[PDB]
Amino acid sequence: IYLRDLKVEDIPLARITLPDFRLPEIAIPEFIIPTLNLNDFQVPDLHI
């Protein structure tokens, strides 16, 4: 005839267990610069 018991939460029906806390993995792309050459096409003949 009064307030009900509060231990019902101990019953599995009331449990809310779930996974969480995702994390990412690391993978960084590479950076590249070409092996450029231009002396092949011309070479100065003057003297400085």
UniProtKB/Swiss-Prot annotation:
It comes from the Eukaryota. It is found in: Cytoplasm; Secreted; Lipid droplet. Palmitoylated; structural requirement for proper assembly of the hydrophobic core of the lipoprotein particle. Induction: Up-regulated in response to enterovirus 71 (EV71) infection (at protein level). It is linked to Hypobetalipoproteinemia, familial, 1: A disorder of lipid metabolism characterized by less than 5th percentile age- and sex-specific levels of low density lipoproteins, and dietary fat malabsorption. Clinical presentation may vary from no symptoms to severe gastrointestinal and neurological dysfunction similar to abetalipoproteinemia. Interacts with PCSK9. Interacts with MTTP. Interacts with AUP1. Interacts with CIDEB. Apolipoprotein B is a major protein constituent of chylomicrons (apo B-48), LDL (apo B-100) and VLDL (apo B-100). Apo B-100 functions as a recognition signal for the cellular binding and internalization of LDL particles by the apoB/E receptor. This is Apolipoprotein B-100. It comes from Homo sapiens (Human). The chain holds residues 2691 to 2738 of 4563 of the full protein.
